[PDB]
Structure formats: C-alpha cells, structure tokens
Design a protein around this ligand. Structure first.
Ligand code: ADP
Ligand code: MG
Length: 323
C-alpha cells in the first residue's frame, strides 16, 4: 500500500576465482554507470551494479541499512541473495560471521540493531526473537531443533503467517545471535550426507523479530526482517543416476519459480499476488510486497563459462521493473 512493490534489485559480481582462471575463463562483464552491466552487448540496468571488489560494507549500506531502519520503525522487510552456486550468495548474506571487515549482511544487521537499541535504552523496552529454518524439496526443517522436520505454514487469528512449531529464540546480544546462526549451521549437517549438494539445493531463512514498547508513550512496534539465502538458481548440469547418454530432465526450483511469479505479480501492480505457490512465499507473505521493503541481491560470476547462467540471473532480477 506504500508504493506497491518496494522491490530493489542490486547485482553483485564477484572476482573470478582461481578455478575459473585456471580453466582459462575470461571476464565478460562490462560496466556502465553505477547501475548497468553489459553482457553479450545487451545492457541490464538495476538499482545498482557492484563490481568485483565492492566491499561488504558497501553492499550493506546500499542494500540493507535502510531496511533495518524500517524494521526498527516497525515495518517488515525481506532481503534475498539470488544466483547460481558459487556466485556469492552466502558470502553476501553472512560472509565471515566474526570478521569486522569480512562479515556479510546478517552480522552487520544484528550489529546495527543492538547498537540502535543501546542508543535508545531510555523509555523503550525491546524484545528480539530469532528463528532459523531451511526449505529443501518444499519441506521446512527447524535448524534450531532437528526433530522439527516437515513443518507446516499456518495463519494466525490476525492473518499473520507462521511456521507451526518453529523454534523462536529470544536473543539479547550480537554474540547470542551469532551463536544461534552457528548452531543452525552445525545442526544443518544432521541427516545430510553431502552438505555441498544440500547447501546449494536448499534455502536458508533467518528471521529477526524486533518488538519494542515505549513505557511512557505506550505505542508498541513490531517488525520482522527475513534474511534469505536461496538455493542455487542453476538447475542445469545435474549429475548422477538417470538416462546416461540421454538427460535434460530438471525443473527450476519450486520456491524460486514461486518467488519469480510473486515478484512479477507485484511488479505488474496486480491486486492478487500468488503467495500460495510455495511454502516460502506463503511464510514471507507479510514481509514481501505490500508495505514492505524488499532487496534482492542477485550475485553473478563474471566468467565466460557462466555466461548463460548469468543471463538467467540478470533476467530474474529484471522481473522487478523499476522506475
Ligand atoms: N565478492 C567476493 N569476494 C571474494 N570472494 C568471493 C566473493 N563472493 C564469493 N566469493 C567466494 O567464492 C566462494 C563461493 O561463494 P559463496 O558465497 O559460498 O557461493 P554461493 O553463491 O554458492 O553461496 C567462497 O569462498 C566465497 O567467499
Ligand atoms: Mg551457499
């Protein structure tokens, strides 16, 4: 209702890696202005385009800073990291959790929430609760409690969605939150044979609920910020058991396609948005579109080898036609 589709898209290119250089790949991305990248002669503009040496600090200031303010202002928000595997999603969303320079968006957000709280501490009473869960094969598992598997989405008395039985943990300091993230990351290995395969094919969702009440004013505020590290958008090249010399069978991830439809619908100014297309979009319903701010950071390898995948990513990001 604020502006309808408050979706910003930033494209982040990472440096060519040693494997790409070793392979003999070339840097195909050309840049123009602070918002356009050129691939195969075709220009793609976005809210911003980050070249290969952009800092975690620049990404946070341009992509998340304002959203954090909105959450403290009492609004909901969502920030996504989209792209093929090895593009830079995790580096962007979390990076080095404890390195002041190398930390990603999540650490910097936590840092800013508490710092803000510390500068308040007068008449405002805060309460921060976090949740950490993953979506694999359109099934939800609690990363804070590995017994909570295949959870279901439900809507409460006031339409607000929630994951039935998902752990909600009250945190009181940045360190408590990082410990929570660290626990979730360790818990994730449970019942997973191949973590590489699993991580690239699943979605991590970290929720930060910031509630506050001014003891004097009495006006209460509550904001939810969902931080999402999506599954790899590259469906192609699925190796394994199937038609040996005859295969090309694999779809686009259910949640990614559901997200695509939701973003396109919002971009079109449609009154009906297809949130029900997936558990992910259903849970995110009260924080995606509407009167919520949303930043999607599409990450890309500048490699000649990943040219076609990059095109796809760029195209996905374009679903949110801005003006
Ligand atoms: N912006 C970057 N600067 C330096 N190294 C990067 C950059 N982005 C990604 N990498 C590195 O490339 C590797 C794969 O990136 P990662 O974020 O794990 O990929 P994914 O998109 O699969 O989550 C990691 O070591 C990561 O730190
Ligand atoms: Mg990853």
């Amino acid at each position: 209702d604020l502006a309808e589709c408050n979706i910003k898209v930033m494209c982040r290119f990472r440096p060519l890696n040693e494997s790409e250089v070793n392979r003999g790949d070339k840097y195909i991305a050309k840049f123009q202005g602070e918002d356009t990248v050129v691939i195969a002669s075709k220009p793609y503009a976005f809210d911003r385009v980050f070249q290969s040496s952009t800092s975690q600090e620049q990404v946070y200031n341009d992509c998340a800073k304002k959203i954090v303010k909105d959450v403290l202002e009492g609004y909901n928000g969502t920030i996504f990291a989209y792209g093929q595997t090895s593009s830079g999603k995790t580096h962007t969303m979390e990076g080095k959790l404890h390195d002041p320079e190398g930390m990603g968006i999540i650490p910097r957000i936590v840092q800013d929430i508490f710092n803000y709280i510390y500068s308040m501490d007068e008449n405002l009473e805060f309460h921060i609760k976090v949740s950490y869960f993953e979506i694999y094969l359109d099934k939800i598992r609690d990363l804070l409690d590995v017994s909570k598997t295949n959870l279901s989405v439900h809507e409460d008395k006031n339409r607000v969605p929630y994951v039935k039985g998902c752990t909600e943990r009250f945190v009181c300091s940045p360190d408590e939150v990082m410990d929570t993230i660290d626990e979730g990351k360790s818990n994730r290995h449970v019942a997973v044979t191949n973590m590489n395969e699993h991580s690239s094919r699943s979605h991590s969702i970290f929720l930060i609920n910031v509630k506050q009440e001014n003891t004097q004013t009495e006006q209460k505020l509550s904001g939810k910020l969902y931080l999402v590290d999506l599954a790899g958008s590259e469906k192609v090249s699925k190796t394994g058991a199937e038609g040996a010399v005859l295969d090309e069978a694999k779809n686009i991830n259910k949640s990614l396609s559901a997200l695509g439809n939701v973003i396109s619908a919002l971009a079109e100014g449609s009154t009906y948005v297809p949130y029900r297309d997936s558990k992910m979009t259903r849970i995110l319903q009260d924080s995606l579109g509407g009167n919520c701010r949303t930043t999607i950071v599409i990450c890309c390898s500048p490699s000649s080898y990943n040219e076609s995948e990059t095109k796809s990513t760029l195209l996905f990001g374009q679903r949110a036609k801005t003006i």
